Write a protein that binds this ligand. Structure first.
Ligand SMILES: CCc1c(N2CCN(C(=O)c3ncccc3O)CC2)c(=O)n2nc(C3=CCOCC3)nc2n1CC(=O)Nc1ccc(C(F)(F)F)cc1C
Ligand SMILES: [Zn+2]
Length: 422
């Protein structure tokens, strides 16, 4: 059930609004992540989606729920007109605001009668005072910037009309921005984050099947060097991995132990955990991105905001505690689209320890959410079925699942597919 992934749970008023104005009885997990971050945290977002299926709900739902205004900035005039028309058909007041609009329509926007207002980036930069007035008198729930990759000079479609959207955060500092694009390029994404002046944005990336990620689950011995030796290559008088690697561990103590063994081999590596000083954490991050260290041995604390496309290997040294956390972690591998591998090395004792630590969570609702995330991970680790099929069924839509049927069953899919093949 994908309702298990919704943290925190949507309330009855939110569900009633979804059914009444959008015709859905439930939120998809990625939509809920964006909607909740906007409503409760006013958080900036970068939502990358391979297709337009379920994209508009992320930015249309929040202003409708709070009865305020959502501004949508896009250069796709005909699509914006179609979306305005579909909103009106659902009894949601919406309009395309341009230089040709009537004074009667602009007066109703100023009075807070329209929930969604679509504008071009050119109209937006020429009428900032209007947006400041709307924020002061009504309140803008969010600003959605569609085709956000157009603000990047290294993208395939740079538009100067988008560069000016860099002033949105200075004109409207409390308004969260939801940048939308179909490109999953991590380098283009860094430029979107910077040029729009987004602060700690939540990043989501959905609709991609990623056949370049090989998945394997293997039993551990707990003898660290014995477990990691198959991944190592003797190079001169020291040892190395095939490429940039992240080893995710369940604890700070395990990161020190694993790094200690790899340091004995003079492997280029560093430790990362939330117990380190700010300067030491910055240096490991800096050295990994500059390729001055090949391998980072880390807790869950490492990973977000790393613009690194050539992570060739992710190793989870110990059973992951949470299926959702595992998904974010392996998603950091092979963002350049080249072959990468994601291996879990685990033992039943790791799961028993993980379960004991779960009893330490004081918030009962959160503890149950975490318990459900752990149960999904345990089932995945013990499974003899396709690993890719399990993961996509938990996190992706039916189209992406359907698209993965081409690699499923083949020698490049996962360890279970290779074992079933021969
Ligand atoms: C897991 C989501 C995801 C990515 N995040 C972004 C957020 N984040 C942050 O660290 C992060 N969060 C918050 C703030 C800042 C941050 O930086 C973690 C990594 C990502 O960076 N990318 N990049 C892509 C590409 C797709 C195709 O072009 C190349 C790049 N896809 C994602 N995804 C989706 C994805 O990987 N799905 C997926 C699909 C199939 C499999 C399977 F079955 F094959 F194994 C496995 C998986 C996981
Ligand atoms: Zn498989």
């Amino acid at each position: 059930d994908d309702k298990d992934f919704l943290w925190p749970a949507p309330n009855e008023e939110q569900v009633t609004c979804l059914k009444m104005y959008f015709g859905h009885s439930s939120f998809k997990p990625v939509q809920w992540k964006v909607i909740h971050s906007v409503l409760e945290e006013a958080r900036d977002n970068v939502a990358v989606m391979a297709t337009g299926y379920g994209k508009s709900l992320c930015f249309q739902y929040p202003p409708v729920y709070v009865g305020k205004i959502g501004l949508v900035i896009s250069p796709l005039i005909s699509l914006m007109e179609d979306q305005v028309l579909q909103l009106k058909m659902s009894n949601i007041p919406a309009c395309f605001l341009g230089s040709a609009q009537s004074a009667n329509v602009l007066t109703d926007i100023k009075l807070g009668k329209y929930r969604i207002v679509y504008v071009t980036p050119e109209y937006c930069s020429g009428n900032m005072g209007l947006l400041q007035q709307l924020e002061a008198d009504i309140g803008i729930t969010l600003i959605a910037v569609d085709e956000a990759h157009c603000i990047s000079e290294w993208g395939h479609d740079f538009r100067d009309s988008f560069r000016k959207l860099g002033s949105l955060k200075t004109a409207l500092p409390m308004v969260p921005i939801v940048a939308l694009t179909a490109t999953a390029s991590s380098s283009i994404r860094e430029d979107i984050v910077r040029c729009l002046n987004l602060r700690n944005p939540q990043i989501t990336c959905t609709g991609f099947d990623r056949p370049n990620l090989y998945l394997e689950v293997r039993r551990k011995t707990g003898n660290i060097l014995q477990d990691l030796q198959p991944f190592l290559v003797k190079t001169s008088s020291h040892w190395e991995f095939e490429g940039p690697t992240i080893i995710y561990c369940p604890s700070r103590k395990m990161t020190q132990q694993v790094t200690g063994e790899l340091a004995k081999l003079n492997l280029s590596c560093g430790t990362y955990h939330a117990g380190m000083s700010f300067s030491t954490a910055k240096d490991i991050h800096h050295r990994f991105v500059r390729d001055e260290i090949q391998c980072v041995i880390a807790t869950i604390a490492f990973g977000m905001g790393i613009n690194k496309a050539d992570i060739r290997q992710v190793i989870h040294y110990g059973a992951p505690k949470d299926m959702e956390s595992y998904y974010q972690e392996i998603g950091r591998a092979g963002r350049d689209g080249l072959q990468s591998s994601c291996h879990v090395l685990w033992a039943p004792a790791d799961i028993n320890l993980n379960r004991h630590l779960l009893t330490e969570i004081r918030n009962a609702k959160f503890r149950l959410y975490k318990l459900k995330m752990m149960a999904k991970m345990e089932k995945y680790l013990h499974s003899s079925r396709c690993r890719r099929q399990i993961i996509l069924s938990h996190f992706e839509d039916k189209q992406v699942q359907k698209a993965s049927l081409g690699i499923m069953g083949t020698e490049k899919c996962c360890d279970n597919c290779r074992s079933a093949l021969d």
